[PDB]
Structure 1
Amino acid sequence: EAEVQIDRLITGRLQSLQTYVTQQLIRAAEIRASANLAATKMSECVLGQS
Protein backbone atom coordinates (compact mmCIF):
# COMPACT_ATOMS: atom_id res chain seq x y z
CA GLU A 1 0.00 0.00 0.00
CA ALA A 2 2.95 2.35 0.43
CA GLU A 3 4.06 1.94 -3.19
CA VAL A 4 0.89 3.66 -4.40
CA GLN A 5 1.42 6.54 -1.99
CA ILE A 6 5.13 6.91 -2.69
CA ASP A 7 4.53 7.11 -6.43
CA ARG A 8 2.16 10.06 -5.94
CA LEU A 9 4.99 11.94 -4.23
CA ILE A 10 7.59 10.89 -6.78
CA THR A 11 5.50 12.19 -9.67
CA GLY A 12 4.91 15.56 -8.01
CA ARG A 13 8.51 16.09 -6.96
CA LEU A 14 9.77 15.16 -10.42
CA GLN A 15 7.38 17.64 -11.98
CA SER A 16 8.56 20.39 -9.65
CA LEU A 17 12.26 19.72 -10.23
CA GLN A 18 11.79 19.70 -13.98
CA THR A 19 9.87 22.98 -13.89
CA TYR A 20 12.77 24.48 -11.95
CA VAL A 21 15.21 23.25 -14.57
CA THR A 22 13.23 24.63 -17.53
CA GLN A 23 12.88 28.11 -16.07
CA GLN A 24 16.62 28.24 -15.38
CA LEU A 25 17.41 27.48 -19.02
CA ILE A 26 15.11 30.30 -20.06
CA ARG A 27 16.66 32.71 -17.55
CA ALA A 28 20.22 31.76 -18.48
CA ALA A 29 19.53 32.40 -22.18
CA GLU A 30 18.66 35.96 -21.19
CA ILE A 31 21.70 36.51 -18.97
CA ARG A 32 23.79 35.24 -21.89
CA ALA A 33 22.59 37.99 -24.23
CA SER A 34 23.28 40.66 -21.64
CA ALA A 35 26.82 39.40 -21.17
CA ASN A 36 27.25 39.31 -24.95
CA LEU A 37 26.25 42.98 -25.10
CA ALA A 38 28.62 43.82 -22.23
CA ALA A 39 31.46 42.14 -24.08
CA THR A 40 30.74 44.26 -27.17
CA LYS A 41 30.58 47.47 -25.16
CA MET A 42 33.91 46.66 -23.52
CA SER A 43 35.45 46.29 -27.00
CA GLU A 44 33.78 49.25 -28.65
CA CYS A 45 33.52 51.85 -25.87
CA VAL A 46 36.49 51.04 -23.62
CA LEU A 47 39.12 49.95 -26.17
CA GLY A 48 37.90 52.34 -28.84
CA GLN A 49 35.91 55.45 -29.68
CA SER A 50 32.48 54.61 -31.05
Structure 2
Amino acid sequence: LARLDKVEAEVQIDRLITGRLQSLQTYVTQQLIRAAEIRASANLAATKM
Protein backbone atom coordinates (compact mmCIF):
# COMPACT_ATOMS: atom_id res chain seq x y z
CA LEU A 1 0.00 0.00 0.00
CA ALA A 2 2.93 2.37 0.58
CA ARG A 3 4.72 1.35 -2.62
CA LEU A 4 2.29 0.34 -5.40
CA ASP A 5 -0.68 1.84 -7.21
CA LYS A 6 -4.12 0.39 -6.42
CA VAL A 7 -4.69 -1.32 -9.79
CA GLU A 8 -1.71 -3.63 -9.24
CA ALA A 9 -1.47 -3.42 -5.45
CA GLU A 10 -4.76 -5.33 -5.71
CA VAL A 11 -2.91 -8.09 -7.59
CA GLN A 12 -0.15 -8.36 -4.99
CA ILE A 13 -2.59 -8.24 -2.06
CA ASP A 14 -4.83 -10.84 -3.72
CA ARG A 15 -1.90 -13.25 -3.41
CA LEU A 16 -1.44 -12.50 0.30
CA ILE A 17 -5.21 -12.78 0.84
CA THR A 18 -5.31 -16.20 -0.85
CA GLY A 19 -2.25 -17.42 1.07
CA ARG A 20 -3.36 -16.08 4.45
CA LEU A 21 -6.90 -17.37 3.97
CA GLN A 22 -5.52 -20.79 3.01
CA SER A 23 -3.17 -20.64 6.00
CA LEU A 24 -6.04 -19.82 8.38
CA GLN A 25 -8.57 -22.34 7.04
CA THR A 26 -5.90 -25.04 7.47
CA TYR A 27 -5.45 -24.12 11.15
CA VAL A 28 -9.22 -23.99 11.72
CA THR A 29 -9.66 -27.48 10.23
CA GLN A 30 -6.91 -29.00 12.38
CA GLN A 31 -8.46 -27.39 15.47
CA LEU A 32 -11.80 -28.98 14.58
CA ILE A 33 -10.06 -32.37 14.49
CA ARG A 34 -8.22 -31.74 17.77
CA ALA A 35 -11.51 -30.60 19.32
CA ALA A 36 -13.02 -33.93 18.21
CA GLU A 37 -10.19 -35.66 20.10
CA ILE A 38 -10.42 -33.67 23.35
CA ARG A 39 -14.20 -34.09 23.20
CA ALA A 40 -13.66 -37.85 23.33
CA SER A 41 -11.31 -37.50 26.32
CA ALA A 42 -13.87 -35.24 27.98
CA ASN A 43 -16.59 -37.83 27.35
CA LEU A 44 -14.30 -40.50 28.81
CA ALA A 45 -13.31 -38.30 31.77
CA ALA A 46 -17.00 -37.64 32.43
CA THR A 47 -17.69 -41.39 32.21
CA LYS A 48 -14.87 -42.26 34.62
CA MET A 49 -16.17 -39.57 36.98
TM-score range, shorter chain: 0.7 to 0.9
TM-score scaled to structure 2, two decimals?
Answer: 0.82
Give the alignment's Cα RMSD to 1 decimal.
0.5
Structure 2 unmatched runs, 5+: 1-7
Identical aligned pairs, as a percentage?
100
> When the two structures are superposed, what TM-score results if normalisation uses the length of structure 1?
0.80
Structure 1: tracts of 5 or more residues without a match: 43-50
Query: Relative contact order: is structure 1 or structure 2 higher (C-alpha 8 Å, sep ≥ 6)?
Result: 2
* Aligned structure 1 segments of 4 or more residues deviating by more than 3 angstroms: none
